[PDB]
Amino acid sequence: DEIDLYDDKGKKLAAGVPLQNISPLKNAAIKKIVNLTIRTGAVDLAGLEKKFATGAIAGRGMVIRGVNRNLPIVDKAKEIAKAVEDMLRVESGDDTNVELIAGGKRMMVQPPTARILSDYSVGLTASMGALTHAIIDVCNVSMWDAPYVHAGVWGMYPQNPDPGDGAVKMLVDIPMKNEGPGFTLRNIPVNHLAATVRKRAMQGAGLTMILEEAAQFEMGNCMGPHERGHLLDLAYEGLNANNLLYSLIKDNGQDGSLGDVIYAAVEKAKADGVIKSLKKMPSGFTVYDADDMQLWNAYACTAMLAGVCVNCASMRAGQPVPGNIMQACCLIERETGLPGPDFGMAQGASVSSSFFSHSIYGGGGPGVFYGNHIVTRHAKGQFIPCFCAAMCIDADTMYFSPARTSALYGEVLGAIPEFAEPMRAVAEAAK
Amino acid sequence: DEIDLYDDKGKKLAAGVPLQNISPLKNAAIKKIVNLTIRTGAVDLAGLEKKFATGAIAGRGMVIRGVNRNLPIVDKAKEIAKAVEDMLRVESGDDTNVELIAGGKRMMVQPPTARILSDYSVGLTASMGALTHAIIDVCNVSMWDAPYVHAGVWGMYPQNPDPGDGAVKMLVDIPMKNEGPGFTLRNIPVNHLAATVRKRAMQGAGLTMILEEAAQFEMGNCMGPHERGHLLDLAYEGLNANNLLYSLIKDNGQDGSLGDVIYAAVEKAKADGVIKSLKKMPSGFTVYDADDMQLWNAYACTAMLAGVCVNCASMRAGQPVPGNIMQACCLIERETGLPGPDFGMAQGASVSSSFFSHSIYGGGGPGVFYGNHIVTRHAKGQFIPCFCAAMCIDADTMYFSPARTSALYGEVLGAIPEFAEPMRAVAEAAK
Amino acid sequence: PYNDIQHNFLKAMSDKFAEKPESTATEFYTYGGIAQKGGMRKREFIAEASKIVDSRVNSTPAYNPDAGMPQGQRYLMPYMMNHTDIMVNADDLHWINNAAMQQAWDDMKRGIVLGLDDAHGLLEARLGKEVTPDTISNYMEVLNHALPGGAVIQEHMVETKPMLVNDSYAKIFSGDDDLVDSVDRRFILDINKEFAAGYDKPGEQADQLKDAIGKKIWQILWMPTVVARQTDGGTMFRWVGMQVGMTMINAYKLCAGESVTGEFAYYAKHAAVVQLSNYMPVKRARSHNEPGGMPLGINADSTRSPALFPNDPIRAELESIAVAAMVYDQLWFGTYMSGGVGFTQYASATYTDNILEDFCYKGCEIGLDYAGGKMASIKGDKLNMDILEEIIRAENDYALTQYEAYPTVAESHFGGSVRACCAAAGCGSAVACATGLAQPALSAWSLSMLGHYERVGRLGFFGYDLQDQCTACGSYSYQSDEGMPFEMRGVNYPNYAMNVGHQSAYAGLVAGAHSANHDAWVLSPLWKVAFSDRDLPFDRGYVTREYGLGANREYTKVAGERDLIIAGHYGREPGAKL
Amino acid sequence: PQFTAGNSHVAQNRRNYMDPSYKLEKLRDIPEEDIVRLLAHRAPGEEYKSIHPPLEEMEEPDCAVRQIVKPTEGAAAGDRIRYVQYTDSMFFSPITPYQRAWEALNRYKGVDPGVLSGRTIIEARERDIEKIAKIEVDCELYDTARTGLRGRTVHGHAVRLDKDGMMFDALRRWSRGADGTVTYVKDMIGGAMDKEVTLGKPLSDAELLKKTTMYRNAQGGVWQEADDPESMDVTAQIHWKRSVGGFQPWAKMKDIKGGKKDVGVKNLKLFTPRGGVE
């Protein structure tokens, strides 16, 4: 199998790319994106400083009277940043990195790959361990006061298994909150991803599908012949293989409806020989079959994402995506008599997410979902990239937007070249 | 800081080794060990074939009637093994490895490191996913019957988060059952470690402590100056640095009491200038202090493993270890006016584990504990190695012994050179 | 409808509505709201609210239809419990208003199974202590004093009041007939007596169980209901551990606290224990023995229908369904995972009015028709998509026609979600009866739901068909979290983890395949036996009858009340009545 | 496009309602201001609120997709997102919930439709949704007896009809005149309006049978399996292809043990009479 890779403007990036070259297991760009995703922390030092000064060093709605200390962490930001960097370093010239941001109000921390022996959550712990000792040493905190520093940095942990109230913010979560073995890279909010690609839809879809598919491998879903179907989905839906994705959007973006995209995709599938007549029914309706079912699935998934982009961008809003994915799947099946994206699983997740974005029971708008979420985890990688796309496209119509929930990620992770331009990163490495 | 590394027979292995050379972050042997620990699965093919034949494909006390199938997995052990290998392999020549054992009744599986993108439990899932497709393919399982094969290999998962009823057995557990970020390498039952080194106490203690300290780093307990103390505890207690551990056991092995070992170690501490007089009290009792407190701790921690070995080897029983550690800690404090191993944390874990090995409330014999266990997790690395030694030393006096709980591990992992001889592997690396 | 009124919906429809069952028209707006018969509870509720408000320091208001949605512009209908003649008020099916439903789940939650053989093995190995039927008998006597909260070793112990914990005791069962004969019969749950049911001869069910169980000895221990209510399901295996621990010490003259005691702890809490369910991923964090981890097959095995009515696979379905609707939908989805008014009718639709009953008996009939009148014959080489599709389409047309042709039935099942649940259950039953196999029931489930959407132009609620669209794919999948045998699924199987109107039916399908297959259990021989225990408060053999008694406040079997130790109730003033 | 399978007039109704080239018949002409009254998100004459500045006076993210997809007029203006919602009687409503979403996402740009048994909601930018509401209330997809505008308290789609053929409404949003004419006397959530809004007379039973998208084996509707085997033939096919794919995505039907011999089946037998009543 071979594909050409294209960018978000319909311009070709690489040709005659063997399908294996974009595999999460082999592509150096993907491997790098994964590595950065588990290593990179963001810290709001100004907010942390304020935590210590007010005694707001615990969880939501908590305040401890009498333990207010004034620790000039923003003032001494440069010393803190260097202490941390030196602690994180295992050997000179290694991939350890620490950068101050916004006049030292904020900080990026990247422990070196070598500190991760078995547990990806070292990216969090090394930083948290380094930061709290850094503060204590640099600001000359006494024994008596040391525990307040622990609380400021580690939050309610270990009393709460979740150190989420602490200072170091990752894209990923602690291992316990993962819904299964191999779900690590799925536990990343859509709003964080949307913020990270700075609200550019195709980059968001691409980045999100790169992470989803890598997770799919890690979950054990890509063994033997099962692999091919995932790599095709990734290439076509995620990486705009042979310009199918961009083409569908461009051709229908002016006055096209969701259905228009779907039908244009069926017609392209036919033209390309992906699907062909199996049987003509009494009404004249033709049921189609596909010699290469996995390839059809790739075409369908691309149709799905393109349909989402067209409709959501028309509304300049994110909320439509679940109902968009549903009718994308349903309609493509009714048009052809073939099975929809991920053999019904995508439609399934579109039903639950439709429900849990319009009801009292849970969920929220699309930006609070993610691959690990019980509501949206069901499809085998093709589903959540549509959500990120939708929340990039959203013109802040929603209350829980990336601007509200994820500013920190936009600011700190936004300038990471592999995050900003994931498709070009992959295409380069696949050459 | 420098140490000489001695073997389990008191012979010097390497001279003037720089303290950093035995760091889990740096030593290539410790690194390979961690690698082998998360990658290596054992599969009882015989027992698996029986599951499918009896319909006992679920959890304890469960049998599904009418789904019995005769799948000749052991007869086709060859085909299956190769099918799994070919699925696990990422690139030709890589570190993928699959072996048959006991006439094809048991099987060792090691996915290549390259499949582990972020999540260590790929060691489990890659093998599980490969094993279940391999069986379906080689044994020509029809669509209708495929779910039975999933049950047999994956256990109750996903309904049960724990796939422990499944067919692939690792030393480590699933991420959800880790008691925190960084705890991966701690979730390894003492009995499994004891079987793995085939009941040779010192290799059991060393292997266990290599893994424990690897974990301490990953928990974030080894940042800044804290790092030094952990490397010292590893070198002395774990690696018999300067032959201190051995000489302690050797000198008291004939008719020494636990107490004799404690004092032997104390006098050695003075002689080495580790501790020295601080103040003579009115009774004549002298309070000691230590210029290098971290070095003292490393000494007390070796005395602790020494005492345990001497008293347990005397009874040839595993059960005394908790109470041994307790009094090792207590008596060394009462003798010096200095703080005990891990500054009281080890005595702490000795109290809980005493309790929870002689009462109705939980735990069991020392063999059922492990670093991650709530009862024994408290010491920062020094404690659990004593338990592995004790259960190596046990003359099968306990009902829940490695012979009973862990034969699969002893059989399959026992042949791995780095497990069989971790101290030698580490020293050759530190050259 | 089905030909036999004992299983069809015609008596229920006739007795619910003034018009004929096939009537297409009725009358609205003339019932006076809750003035009508079916408003009786709501009028009761209004009278009570006033007292509640009077008792509050700032007169914070409570129940008030005028502050919400007043009820009864349409007929407020009663319901008939499935396969009974018991009518009930709708309001009386809410779990909060129904003590029988509460007891049914408390009974399940407070149960733990624990092997004894390993403990004997440990006694032998480390102490060389003799175990005989006599010492086992003494052990069980001590255990039955200890388990509810009685002291066996220490002086100056406080103890529990027996009438507060009178539902707690322990029995043993075993495949070893000679051991059972030798033990004091007061402590025995007797398999030959509870499973004399057979198909071609007496005791075949017992035979199946004793062969599966073998010469092992198992304990079923029930904890006090009040313990389930004060705490959670995670207490249960731990409580067994503690009291079995104390019993061992006494009955075998050990040190009260030596190394052997430690190993007994691990034996009891880990090595030989069999729980109702395991914990949950932390988003929906829950202790052990809660509904979230309980497989469908265990739900089914907890009913007695197959031992009481061995030739009636659909009664087995419908009794398992009644337990499952209440447990998974009313309590688990409707409370544990949400709360409020909740999901009473999403559940009760599957156990009232003989509507699901009607579909499933018709389903079995159709499936048998296609199986040439030989139940469970469609297996192996006879099992294919053609015959399945024929069966499913036939029964789906049957069931969906009922709602359309007899509009009282649709009016009772007013939400599409329960119509879908029930039509699909009917299709599944048809396949269960033809095949004697659970997995293909999933193929019927998928096609029924897809056929439903296609026929009617609608299905269920906003997120009803998540698992339904996943069903075909998950059918025979073997991927990590995507596949697993039907019997072993439950509400932690990912696409099952959020929605009402499925788990009820599934519990039925899993039971039907197995009863049709002449199997004495679905998933667990151990739980099958344990739940046969006739000293349990709630009657696991007549589920819908129990629900009916709870509804009409005639139920006499609730446990764990505290009337014996209080002088009054919150919000209710003491003093004699005038 | 094919749109959907099916050989009956009900299947053709489906295909037409989905077909943007097909012009839906208009039964009534509700003035825009009366539409605004019914929706009750704003008062007629009241200016559209904004949730953000018009896109033109704003710098959007440098997004290729925003670049090539034109916003609707509602989106460009930064309108609120509001909604319209319908309840469709099981007694031969002209259109059914699922077919509404098919219709909406084929015919309209920039919409968020949701399908349930007793309600179908469409969300869009306020001015956009006002336009969609008028089109859908005016045309043959709305019958004044078997369809209802309802943003809450939707109960009734599956409830028997009244003497006059009206679907139950617990909020009594409609009133019926002697001549059959239906007037809305409350807004779509049961709130008071400044004036009543006349919708018109209901279609006759024969017309409803002619216009409906539902298969219904009662009261003279289409019996799906007896009158249109193609319908389930193709739906089943989709079902089995999803089944095969979940097991092994690359697998063809012919490679499956006991796989379908063909689309359709040879031996389907029915177990109800036409009209179902026995």
Ligand SMILES: C[C@@H](OP(=O)(O)O)[C@H](NC(=O)CCCCCCS)C(=O)O
């Ligand atoms: C989705 C999830 O909610 P969150 O997205 O985490 O708020 C989940 N709710 C449940 O799935 C609701 C199930 C019961 C109510 C719906 C009945 S159909 C839960 O609370 O864990």
Ligand SMILES: C[C@@H](OP(=O)(O)O)[C@H](NC(=O)CCCCCCS)C(=O)O
């Ligand atoms: C140790 C552990 O037991 P296990 O080792 O898992 O059997 C744990 N028990 C509790 O810590 C017992 C605490 C209460 C009884 C003793 C009070 S001093 C538990 O059941 O989770």
Ligand SMILES: O=S(=O)(O)CCS
């Ligand atoms: O949100 S829905 O309206 O679909 C139903 C929940 S009861």
Ligand SMILES: [Cl-]
């Ligand atoms: Cl006994």
